[PDB]
RNA sequence: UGCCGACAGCGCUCUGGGGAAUUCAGGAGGGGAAAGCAGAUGUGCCCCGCGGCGAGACUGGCGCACCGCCGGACGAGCUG
């Protein structure tokens, strides 16, 4: 990937496009915290927080005990991407986004998803920690 | 002929003035002959052409070549202003920058190139 | 976090500074500045807190002509970032300005202490410079650039 | 049963809250208005499937009704009030460019096939019409004795100036707009919840019933139901008739649309996925092949009736073959093992 | 306007139709020299220059025309051969070059340390022996 | 340099039409002009005594993206020799003649530009040239020359414009076969010249998709000319040609 | 035959023209054409043979 | 890119392996093709029913930017 040094994205600078997964969506309503705000301050400065598709899918097709974060999910004021594929795998969904463009912030929770992309580099996790957000490799805040 | 003219109301005098900056900062070529070679090089930034020229046919065959590589261009209304902006001591039709990708002089030639396409 | 590593290492790099600590050190400033820029949005608009505070640090900002005289607004005053305050960091000038070959020779100078701003000539690298200062500097009088005495190895080779 | 494939899509975005409220325009072909429950509307263009047409916020509280006007408007209720915006304009506005507050929470719209007439169902035991351009308050039209709660109403467009509504008296009332007044009101076993006429036969309507029951009722005669729909488990939400008057959506409560013909008395279609827990507004296109179905999880979702058969412009025998298929499962379509392999959904 | 035709009845293609006509390579030794030649063109810029490593166990393309740098018109001061430089192939340009005296030193080097002792040396060892 | 003069082989490389020529210490890219014998613009050419007809043009990088793509190895460039091109762009026509000469007498490329002298020059090529089109007006309102574009199969895209994507996606929406199939290239500088050139890219992929395209294929020209990108896309299938 | 389309292939899944759930992936053929027997009738003698000692060794 | 090539290993394959002729059973691609049976009833007549065009004539009520609207029902001639 151009824009890249060494495993360091001198690509993502602010402001920052961030991808919710479907743990992390669930997780932050269950801690009831204001998604764009606590994204703010964590990273200080200008986000957009984008929600592929497939993870509102997932989000959907869950129970209707989770309808709430769905529709925290479902606001109008997040930017959308669809995609190509078959049938709602949304780890492989945001694996692949990242992996053909690298300028992300990934948010996730799940140890799986964690594991599978700090096996790609250059690309930051973001995730909860009963407090706040957690940033795992960005250079900069 | 000259249809992409700058209009009046200090675009050409922030024009002027970044031919000032870029000027100091060593990022210039200056005359008709090393506007063409630095386009034709590729280096280039932007150019800025006078339109108060002893027949305007120089300063339309420049944008030939801007045109033939999608490189912007500008026409400034005054060659002699042109020439004191850049500290010549003598009055020039055509003043061309390059780019240099560490500063906010590349941030400024950023906003003059979207006012001129713009214009365009 | 071999990410910090290599991101650390390319800003030295690309301004060829000392260490880690100058670099972490400029770091925490942009880390204030951004502290900043998180309150003051957190208040909303059009409230009056936000209008005159906002307005103070934008204007220290471009007065350190670190932010645009372009863009004017907190957004972009959270998207600054440590290339830009190195942007402004004083050796930088030096090699963008035109005396010194390269951005190490450049150090060696503000060690011997041959540049100046306005009157008194700098020893310090990391003295900050201001946009209505950055055009005056140049060689002082006691420097062979700017002249004075020839100097020692001058004086050797004619001795 | 290989192709058995309905779903065809998801529009927009999905409202942030779900659609409690959505209509059809009738007289276009691809323009819909879909309104949310959390107090805004938006239109879509159906062949721009993506993104949206025209949006904007309507009311307080949750939009009960919306619709369209003949020329071009469009028109919201909710307990606010009744709000008329204009979509197609060439540059947007937000505001609106009528307005009405008076009559109560109104519980729904009902609007005129070919002039200017609306009527509002309000849930006083009150209806009251307005013309366009030359009414203020309308015509306030009930039962003359009467405040139990007026739920719908929908325009007959067989015979046109005919008003039908239900009431929660598990009640009906036949209404007309000549001679203004009431006609007839039936009193059934357990309540009805949406009403409709058949866009053929003039004489045949069909109700929407909490007896989880679809009911086809003749005018002239209320002595007995022309047809009973027994289809369901919880309490259907929508009712529409295809404009074919062959074919009828029956959306529930719970997650199921059932689809139908004039003349089975039990399900002929079934159709669901988990992502939609309950179906609220089940309404046709305008060629009685695509049907629209606005959830409880926001969503306007675009969906085929007779679901296996894959539309376009065929070959000469490849409609041969289709409808050779339709003929033989005619000829047999009672034997047990065909008869299995057939009613065999998934549920 | 109609008349008697001709019946003229009596392997892998020779001029590939979809790149205008280029003929299958006739094998002349000069032509596989200039072959090996741009097979091997890395050690032939011994130094100065590093190329793309083009491996495959053949080298010989089916389909090569030799051909002629014809002209620079805006510039053909120096970038034009003379006409002493010009050379019919391309291996006798290359020899005609410069720089084969390193070539050959080079040689004589590799030639040394693969005469290191494998048989000189131990007959001459012999002799310090049988003497 | 690979001076005037120097005894050169040529051979095809991957892509049906354009040809490679190796030689010496310098190779380069090579097409078979269809124009005989004539330069264009001062570029360098190559004659071979076929066992008078066969002529080849050099093909500079730094002057034409399409070649700087063809050097960047793409997947698939979709113009076979003998295919109908509309060319967007078309600056003085120096690359136009190069896909002039990929598709032969048997193809057709249609050359749109937008100002008038540089339409001087790409004209003049238009009467040497027996297969390209001369189109010079508006390319926003591709309506104009609606009379003139067939349905096509391939779309090349060099213009600078922010609303670029929207121009390629009406021209896609009006002159592409079903299954079509375009190269576009791109500036940072002229989208959005602030941002990383990477997220410019992803915004104007994902613009493409809202275009309807599938994106199929992206590449940075990266030792050519700083931060502009080739891309490549399939117009409303996932395979190439049918 | 030619090669199914969908449909086809999906709904005669059961259907094979060549092989059988009777042939034992042709272990017959396989054998002869491995060993150049020239009477199958002799494989299948073998087969036999081998199977009456495989089923004494069970009952040992 | 020359032949030849022992053991010691790896690769495939084994009704041995090639080469050519030739029958057939399949496959996959490319080019060409107006490639078009969405519901198939002789012509001509007038008449009925009903429908459009369509000259011309009206009328109702509205119109605090006042400049115009919107709607009904009669109707010569033509047509399906
Ligand atoms: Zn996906």
Known sequence: ??????????????????????????????????????????LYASVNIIITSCVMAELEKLGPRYRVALMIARDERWQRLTCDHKGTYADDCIVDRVQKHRIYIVAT????????????????????????????????? | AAWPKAEDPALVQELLDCVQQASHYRQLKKGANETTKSVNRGTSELVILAADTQPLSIVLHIPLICEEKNVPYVYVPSKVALGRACGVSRAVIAVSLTSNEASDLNSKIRALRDKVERLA | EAARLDSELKLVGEYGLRNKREVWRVLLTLSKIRRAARILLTLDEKDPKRLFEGNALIRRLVRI??????????????????EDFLERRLQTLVYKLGLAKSIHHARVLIRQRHIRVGKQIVNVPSFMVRLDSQKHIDFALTSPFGGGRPGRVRRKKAK | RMFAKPFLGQLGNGHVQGVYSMCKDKNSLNCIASGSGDGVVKVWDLTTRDEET???????????????????????????????????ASPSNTTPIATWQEGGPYTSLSFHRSANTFAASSGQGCIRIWDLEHSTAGQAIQWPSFVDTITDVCFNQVETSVIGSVATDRSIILFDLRTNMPVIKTVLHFACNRIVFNPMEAMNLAVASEDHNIYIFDARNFDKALNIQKGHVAAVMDVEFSPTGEELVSGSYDRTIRLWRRDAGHSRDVYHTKRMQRVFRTMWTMDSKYILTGSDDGNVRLWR????????????????????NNALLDRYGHLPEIRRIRRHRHL | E?????????????????????????????????????????????????????????????????????????????????????????????????????????????????????????????????? | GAKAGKKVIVEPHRHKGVFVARGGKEDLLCTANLVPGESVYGEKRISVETPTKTEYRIWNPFRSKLAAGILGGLETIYMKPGSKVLYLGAASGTSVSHVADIVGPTGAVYAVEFSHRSGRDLINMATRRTNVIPIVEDARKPMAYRMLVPMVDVIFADVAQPDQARIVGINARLFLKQGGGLLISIKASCIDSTAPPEQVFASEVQKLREDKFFPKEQLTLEPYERDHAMVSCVYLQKEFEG | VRKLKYHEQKLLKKHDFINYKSDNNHRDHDVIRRYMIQKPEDYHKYNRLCGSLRQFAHRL
Request: glycine letters at 6%.
């Open chain 4, 54 to 88: 025209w949006r904007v916020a309507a009311h307080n509280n949750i939009v009960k009704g919306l619709t369209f006007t003949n020329d071009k408007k469009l028109l919201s209720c909710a307990t606010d009030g009744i709000k008329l915006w204009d979509p197609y």
């Open chain 5, 2 to 131: 109609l008349s008697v035709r001709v019946p003229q009845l009596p392997g892998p293609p020779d001029t590939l139709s979809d790149w205008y006509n280029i003929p299958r390579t006739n094998l002349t030794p000069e032509l596989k020299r200039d072959l090996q030649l741009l097979r091997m063109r890395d050690v032939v810029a011994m130094g100065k220059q590093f190329f793309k490593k083009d491996n495959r166990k053949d080298f010989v393309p089916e389909y090569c025309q030799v051909g002629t740098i014809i002209a620079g018109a805006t510039d053909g001061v120096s970038g034009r051969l003379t006409r002493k430089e010009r050379k019919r192939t391309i291996v006798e340009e290359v020899l005609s070059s410069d720089s084969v005296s390193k070539y050959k030193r080079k040689y004589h080097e590799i030639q040394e340390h693969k005469k290191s002792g494998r048989k000189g040396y131990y007959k001459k060892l012999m002799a310090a022996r049988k003497r």
């Open chain 3, 65 to 82: 002509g670190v932010l645009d005289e372009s863009r004017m607004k907190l957004d972009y005053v959270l998207a600054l970032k440590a």
């Open chain 1, 109 to 141: 929770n799940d140890r799986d998803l964690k594991r599978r992309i700090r096996k790609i580099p250059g690309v930051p996790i973001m995730s909860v920690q009963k407090g706040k957000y957690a940033i795992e490799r960005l250079p900069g805040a």
């Open chain 4, 305 to 324: 009736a007779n679901a296996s058969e894959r539309s376009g412009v065929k070959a000469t025998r490849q409609r041969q073959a289709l409808e050779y």
């Open chain 1, 1 to 42: 990937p151009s824009s890249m040094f060494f495993e360091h994205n001198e690509a993502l600078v602010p402001p920052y496009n961030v991808l919710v997964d479907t743990n992390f969506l669930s997780r932050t309503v269950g801690a009831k915290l204001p998604l764009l705000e606590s994204a703010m301050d964590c």
